[PDB]
Amino acid sequence: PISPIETVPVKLKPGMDGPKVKQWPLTEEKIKALVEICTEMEKEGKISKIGPENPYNTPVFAIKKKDSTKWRKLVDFRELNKRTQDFWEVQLGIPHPAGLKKKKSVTVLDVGDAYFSVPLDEDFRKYTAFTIPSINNETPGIRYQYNVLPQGWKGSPAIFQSSMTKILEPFKKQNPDIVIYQYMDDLYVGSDLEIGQHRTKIEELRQHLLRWGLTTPDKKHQKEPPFLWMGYELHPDKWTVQPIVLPEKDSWTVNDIQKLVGKLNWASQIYPGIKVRQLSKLLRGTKALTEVIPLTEEAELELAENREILKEPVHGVYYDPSKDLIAEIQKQGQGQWTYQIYQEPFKNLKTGKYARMRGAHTNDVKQLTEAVQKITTESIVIWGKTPKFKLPIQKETWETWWTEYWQATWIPEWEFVNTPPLVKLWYQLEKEPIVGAETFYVDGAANRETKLGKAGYVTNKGRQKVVPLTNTTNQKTELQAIYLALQDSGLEVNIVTNSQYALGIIQAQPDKSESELVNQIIEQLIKKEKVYLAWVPAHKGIGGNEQVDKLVS
Amino acid sequence: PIETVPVKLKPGMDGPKVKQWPLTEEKIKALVEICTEMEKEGKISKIGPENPYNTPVFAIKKKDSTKWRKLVDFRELNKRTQDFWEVQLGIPHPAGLKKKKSVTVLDVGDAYFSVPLDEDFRKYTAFTIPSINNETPGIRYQYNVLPQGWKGSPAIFQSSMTKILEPFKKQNPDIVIYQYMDDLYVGSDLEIGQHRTKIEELRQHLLRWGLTPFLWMGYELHPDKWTVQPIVLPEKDSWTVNDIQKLVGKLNWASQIYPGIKVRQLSKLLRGTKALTEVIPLTEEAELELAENREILKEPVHGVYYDPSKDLIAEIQKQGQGQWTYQIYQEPFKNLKTGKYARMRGAHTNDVKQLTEAVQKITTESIVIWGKTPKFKLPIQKETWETWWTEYWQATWIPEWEFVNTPPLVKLWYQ
DNA sequence: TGCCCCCCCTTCGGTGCTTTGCACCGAAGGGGGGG
């Protein structure tokens, strides 16, 4: 046969043979539409018919193109993919319009039958064999093998995407004034040239692609803005995402909320202030995908707030490398954060949100540090540099945090922005014991079998307490003893525990916790004026620790 | 006309399949310029997706260096590459390198590019250059010569290296030379001027082979001036209840290292239920118990020696105010070295930058003293470290590390 | 009823010290999106 472009050697995993899966029953409406498409691939030379010496076979089906009258052919190579060698995908990410520079001339192209315009590895074509019913399995039928990249094979996207780059590489090197964003078969080409020289280079590229067997039909040739590209709309000075459809159903299932939150996440890249905490909080729970969930009072308000954000059309701007990048974060409450990235005020390049709750106990300062890290990586991906940060945290607050924390932490070059609610530390433990403050020696204990336990304290002023606890653990009683000391103490208190577990949690100054008991401890710590925590080894005959260990054990 | 040394992987192991992480604009421009020049010289060649292997790559600037230096994270490949001690291509470690008054480190990695690599092994040295905003998909390359940062390059080149060093080693028999990865460690007891003179001689000695990042840079060490940070008990004459509680907790922990420490007579001082700020005198039995404990902390730990077959482990503690402590060990509580860093670069403003400098300092000391790179237990969150550490790295090697979170319940290594 | 990539939110099981309870993390399955 004819040889299109340079092929790619493909192998099977060692000791593995081709697939033998046969075919499942197919409806007559699909069997009829398939034999028409098979004949076209034979004419163009994309598929050969000879396969009596081929014991392999892979099931085939067909579904229609996205809002297009054409049926798409697909082969379920899932058995072949298990037996095919591994590839390294050259697709490392997704391009974003916020990283595009403004250009005077723009063109968008789509390659015709891309996968079918690249020659497959000669020795591998035998394993791509497939059978199609002739007339409801009455007669044997037509067997075939792929001569090009088939849709459904795990190696098809990587092989085409790499061969596409080799063809464009000489064109890009010989035209440095041009910018080419290649993503699968779709092509973005922009320059600051006059549209006449632009359409000239565009046709030069169209011929160059045709010089390797790649068609560029005019039905997909976009010459006039707004350019539909990667699901956005590209205007000369601004860009915006294509319209987003919000399901307005009155009976929400589990699968409905999953679709709702997914669309809100996609919208948050340009629509600022999107919240999905209370809406996603409805999905937690081992519920079936069809179970109907009633929307809570907080989730209904959250959905209404998101509806108001999407009523007005929002647009982003393009990147100017001559100006700095500015990233401004705002706290939304309940561990929610939104940010905007811009270069000139009120002209956002893109927006986003960070709502990840990592860890059982945390504070806003930690969550802000994590949001900064998300933005930093996101900015390096899109623009290759770290933005200047405007954070709702005072320099004094941040200085106190990182200098005193035991883990290394840091924020890049940033300045304070007085946009409430400000992030702060809600309490600070003293570094030295408090003179004149009552000293509480706390301890706890619980039975590993009965899950029953006691927790109490004893002070230097003679004050004592022991409380029995049911359905508890060693860790819970140790926390409970600290909570008792905080409740029964003045505004200034020294507390001596032997609980490494509790002390590790509290010293990290959390302001929120998944544990109801830790949250109550946090509430007491904010009320106090001076708190000192100290640790002592257990069973060493130390102060009240030996005394209170007997009381609770 | 040089035949290639065949290389195999450890049996039962595939190749490295580590994803490429995002790179800043300045690092991508540096890699594109370097990889284009390395492609003209045949040192690398483009590959496709049929190669399932990949290794991260980025660029660094060494200390006081204005030009970029390509650096590949061959950590996953080195662990999967056969250990050349079994092929007897290992480099013995001179115990006298740590005793010389001055040690200079030279980047001799540029010489590896002259030796070809085994054809069957080139597929494992694959890497990918990313593009800003994913304008272009991954541009994958693979090595055709000995790559920098790979543990097999100095081993294969060692036969070539010892010949180039024979005239200098014989003219200067009192100079110790050690080779580790892309670096060459040269130590002598001469005067500083005569030392740098002998270093400049060794540079021009290599150019005599070069005719038949660059060699001009060098960094001076002083291992004879390296000290250790011992465990110390504070000296007070009036002790509060809280002071003694901290002391007993510290001594109780230290007893895991020194089994002779007792706290029986000091714990009995904390018999009652006293306020923490109450000053209490020391009993007669307690004064002897404290004095006897300081003597134990002076003498060395029994049974602590370096095992060449065990890995080195390093822990680092953030003490604040720019202070950083560290311990190197193989078995727990059997520390081979303890130390403390202060006023490093980035002090009082950047924790990640200081931690990066400490990791480099500890690894360098480990190479000089034992010829190994330890595995680090870093006191930092995983995402916090992986976001910034490349911006402050200035070494040609990269050690293994994991992340921990240990609150300092007992200020053990720094009062 | 196919293939490849990226993002967020939740669950679940493995791992190692807080230890036999509890906290963390990476994989996986749901969704969004791209071709």
Ligand SMILES: Nc1ccn([C@@H]2C[C@@H](O)[C@H](COP(=O)(O)OP(=O)(O)OP(=O)(O)O)O2)c(=O)n1
């Ligand atoms: N469902 C999908 C969608 C896309 N693809 C990949 C992506 C692309 O690399 C290739 C599609 O090749 P085509 O060239 O046929 O793409 P279109 O449907 O746009 O066809 P047309 O505009 O030329 O008439 O196959 C795919 O596997 N499966």
Ligand SMILES: OC[C@H]1O[C@@](CO)(O[C@H]2O[C@H](CO)[C@@H](O)[C@H](O)[C@H]2O)[C@@H](O)[C@@H]1O
């Ligand atoms: O920082 C750890 C981080 O790096 C990765 C990818 O680069 O792995 C590298 O670091 C590990 C820890 O030292 C090595 O074991 C590994 O060989 C090396 O590639 C990630 O795996 C990890 O998240």
Ligand SMILES: [Ca+2]
């Ligand atoms: Ca197409």
Ligand SMILES: [N+]
């Ligand atoms: N106990």
